[PDB]
Amino acid sequence: HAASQMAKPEDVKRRSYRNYGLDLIRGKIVDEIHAGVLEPTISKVKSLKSALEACVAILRIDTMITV
Amino acid sequence: KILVELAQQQDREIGDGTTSVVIIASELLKRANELVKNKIHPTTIITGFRVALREAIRFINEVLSTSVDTLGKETLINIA
Amino acid sequence: NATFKNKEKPQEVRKANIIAARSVADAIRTSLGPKGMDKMIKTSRGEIIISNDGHTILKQMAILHPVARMLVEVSAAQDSEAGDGTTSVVILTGALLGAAERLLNKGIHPTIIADSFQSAAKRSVDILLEMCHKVSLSDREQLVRAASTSLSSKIVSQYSSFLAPLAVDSVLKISDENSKNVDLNDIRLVKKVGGTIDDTEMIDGVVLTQTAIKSAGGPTRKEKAKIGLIQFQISPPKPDTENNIIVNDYRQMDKILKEERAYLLNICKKIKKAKCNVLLIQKSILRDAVNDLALHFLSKLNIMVVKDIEREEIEFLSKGLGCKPIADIELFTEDRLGSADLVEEIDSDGSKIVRVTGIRNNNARPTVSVVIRGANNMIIDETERSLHDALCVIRCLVKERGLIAGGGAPEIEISRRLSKEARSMEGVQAFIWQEFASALEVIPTTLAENAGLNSIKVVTELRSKHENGELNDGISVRRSGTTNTYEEHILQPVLVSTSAITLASECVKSILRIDDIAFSR
């Protein structure tokens, strides 16, 4: 991904070849779009948004009063 | 307990993915705990995550795409 | 050297009282400011709660030590005047006790310490008046910007545009020029479900929380009506003494029913003779307030009846309407009633709220009623309490005119001048004036800590430009740095800081004056 994001923003490319994920059945790197592994955007955006609000609520605790 | 209520918020919105959300919030606390040992105040640690989240949503916009590769080839047949 | 030894050690009590009281404010310092950290509290019942409210922490803390319980009354007296900022008043006292602890380590008796804080507080308020920027109640634009920017820290920012002038004009009715103590209880906030936040009205007369007669014959509206407060209870006859009712016949059961309806009718007739069109029955959970048979009798008389009137409303209705509570039916007279131009039941999307207009009384004084609407129940709840804070901010300007840009700016102006005034003092006091001015710096120091900013860098940079610029140098969280707090619309009225120093002087006084604690049964 780091090598594919070098020529991508420059709007000049030889070959892009981005979006390579993990194939755990064969144990090799393949394109997930061609492999068929897709998740809706609403799942990933709300995941980072919910995980952050839960992490903030923990970082906001400097004191705990236990009866 | 916040993580337990986090699974309730995840089930009432998307309905799936509670496994990955907990792992994210767990590592973020471990990274933020090392920032406390770095003499970084947690308020900026909170704001530093919110600023990165605003760009992360914008970065997904260049990631996400509509339905593609259904003509001339089939990527859906690998799912079935 | 060698001095008075004091074999008996009462100082251990005063030292323990200060340490126990400073431990209270230490956890309060984390919740200071909008970026302040939340605090975890497990109630004695076992419930786990979280919030940044300083007054809520002290309320749910379940404090045991009595000296630490005094800080609750300080935050309560701070809420009675300012209504907001109860976190800063606890932190201010915590540092004065820490500074007084160093004064005790120097061999200074706490009576001189307490008396030195008196001259320190009385002069600091005079210093606070020197930096006061005076405003006027005739200018509504400054009052709207004060209420609008103060509500930007609350969940609803956008609707404060229409909420600010409604909160201003509601207080301007009680803001009449010459007044000393202006009570906010004269403004009644009534929340009802339905509608949106954009819908809010300031009624010219009292508005109740209850509906009208649900049973058969309910008028629901009356024009040109007389209103009164009935502390009596309309019920079939039930003598507390020994009674006997013997029914041997089928017709005797009807005689009992007609006798109970005749007793209810005689009570309804005495009300009709006085020509009281609208009746308000005090809420009584012991027995039934007004029987359904009596409601049908008052329905034929065209008398509107509203029951379940709380005692909180009774004290409010007797003020605006100018009426008087009536204990019994024999004490029911026209002189104790009211006069109302219109009494109707307003139904907006299943609301059915009852309002009263046209007081038309000589006892009529600045009493205001405001109706609050909203979709969710959590809206009309927090939105109401959010307006009470706006009612208090303007109340501060009415009691003590003028406002000052906050963010640590007024605390540095006081600490800087007291540093120069300390050189003009004499004796033991001159050392206390230096410790008193240094204890005031805790407020701008804690704001820089809770915001993530560098402690030393911000406090020194503020005091650096404070030697040239005067009141415009403070902490700004919106800019994430040190800039002008007046252009950032951070404004703290003078009465908030006036009462904070006054309550801090009496608190620390009442603490150091306690040299011992004895169990007395």
Curated annotation (Swiss-Prot), chain B:
Q: How does it assemble?
A: Heterooligomeric complex of about 850 to 900 kDa that forms two stacked rings, 12 to 16 nm in diameter.
User: Would you identify the family this protein belongs to, as annotated?
Assistant: Belongs to the TCP-1 chaperonin family.
Identify this protein by name.
T-complex protein 1 subunit alpha
The protein's gene is named TCP1
| Known role | Molecular chaperone; assists the folding of proteins upon ATP hydrolysis. Known to play a role, in vitro, in the folding of actin and tubulin. In yeast may play a role in mitotic spindle formation.
Q: Where in the cell is it found?
A: Cytoplasm
Q: Which organism is it from?
A: Saccharomyces cerevisiae (strain ATCC 204508 / S288c) (Baker's yeast)
Domain of life of the native organism? Eukaryota
UniProtKB/Swiss-Prot annotation, chain C:
Protein location:
Cytoplasm
Q: Which InterPro entries match?
A: Chap_CCT_delta (IPR012717), Chaperone_TCP-1 (IPR017998), Chaperonin_TCP-1_CS (IPR002194), Cpn60/GroEL/TCP-1 (IPR002423), GroEL-like_apical_dom_sf (IPR027409), GROEL-like_equatorial_sf (IPR027413), TCP-1-like_intermed_sf (IPR027410), TCP-1_chaperonin (IPR053374)
Domain of life, per the record? Eukaryota
PROSITE patterns assigned: TCP1_1 (PS00750), TCP1_2 (PS00751), TCP1_3 (PS00995)
Q: What does this protein do?
A: Molecular chaperone; assists the folding of proteins upon ATP hydrolysis. Known to play a role, in vitro, in the folding of actin and tubulin. In yeast may play a role in mitotic spindle formation.
Record's miscellaneous remark: Present with 5530 molecules/cell in log phase SD medium.
Provide the GO MF annotations for this entry: ATP binding; ATP hydrolysis activity; ATP-dependent protein folding chaperone; unfolded protein binding
Transmembrane domains' residue ranges: none
Protein's recorded name: T-complex protein 1 subunit delta
The organism encoding this protein is: Saccharomyces cerevisiae (strain ATCC 204508 / S288c)
Fetch the CDD domains from UniProt.
Answer: TCP1_delta
Q: Which GO terms are recorded in the biological process aspect for this UniProt protein?
A: chaperone mediated protein folding independent of cofactor; protein folding
